[PDB]
Design a protein around this ligand. Sequence first.
Ligand code: MTA
Ligand code: SO3
Ligand code: SO3
Ligand code: ZN
Ligand code: ZN
Ligand code: ZN
Ligand code: ZN
Ligand code: ZN
Ligand code: ZN
Length: 268
Amino acid sequence: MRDRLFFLLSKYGIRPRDSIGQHFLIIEDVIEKAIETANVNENDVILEVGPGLGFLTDELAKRAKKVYTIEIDQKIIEILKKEYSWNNVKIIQGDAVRVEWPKFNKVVSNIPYKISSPFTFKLLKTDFERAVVMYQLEFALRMVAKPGSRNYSRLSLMAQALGNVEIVMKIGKGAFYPRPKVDSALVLIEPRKDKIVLNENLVKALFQHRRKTVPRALKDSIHMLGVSKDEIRGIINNVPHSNKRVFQLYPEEVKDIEEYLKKHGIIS
Ligand SMILES: CSC[C@H]1O[C@@H](n2cnc3c(N)ncnc32)[C@H](O)[C@@H]1O
Ligand SMILES: O=S([O-])[O-]
Ligand SMILES: O=S([O-])[O-]
Ligand SMILES: [Zn+2]
Ligand SMILES: [Zn+2]
Ligand SMILES: [Zn+2]
Ligand SMILES: [Zn+2]
Ligand SMILES: [Zn+2]
Ligand SMILES: [Zn+2]
């Protein structure tokens, strides 16, 4: 399967990456394991991103009703059309972060690592049942980080606010060409049944400097928006969870800051 990649790459005379965050999955058992973890059946409509040379895509097309696969490289698409004969796959040309997504109930995909963050935020705001995606292990660990831990960040918060996230297994670096410098991780995401929907400008504001207390953080980001300090100082000194640093906040605690600011005219 590494061999099949080498033969496809030479056949079309193409180099195995345009960019730095890109690694082809080349173990059949990790593919079949992503698919079994996702429970892909003949009724499911799947989104995939960065199909590469169609290894995962081919397996998804045997099992699902319909697959949409988003690919940025027009040269890769010409190869997927020549190399495969799928009735039920729709290749979409574009940056997966920018293009409109189709309706899908599931995602099964090895994410190019350069887009791990924007893809994840975009997905969490989507109506899906289940997603099984490959990331770097550090990024996956960031996604399951708990409030108050050192790697807890905007990503962690939103993942916990909107999803249930488990790392299914470590994936060895041996399993990609070219070999990454670190291991990847098979990650399951389901939407929370009881989502905590937070204002994105607020969260962005707060975690611009997640090391600050929540009063410092709110005062700085709202001054930056053009508002007098004196106009803001009182309202923000009565903000809930003021004894916390931003990186210690549960989604539930952000929600109360939001409703407090909403009530006091700041966010609208
Ligand atoms: C899965 S890692 C490599 C594959 O992802 C594709 N790819 C890389 N970046 C993006 C992107 N932003 N949107 C969609 N496909 C991408 C590349 O063209 C390659 O086929
Ligand atoms: O299993 S990882 O350490 O190669
Ligand atoms: O190049 S990979 O290690 O992100
Ligand atoms: Zn096939
Ligand atoms: Zn790091
Ligand atoms: Zn599980
Ligand atoms: Zn100033
Ligand atoms: Zn609190
Ligand atoms: Zn509360």
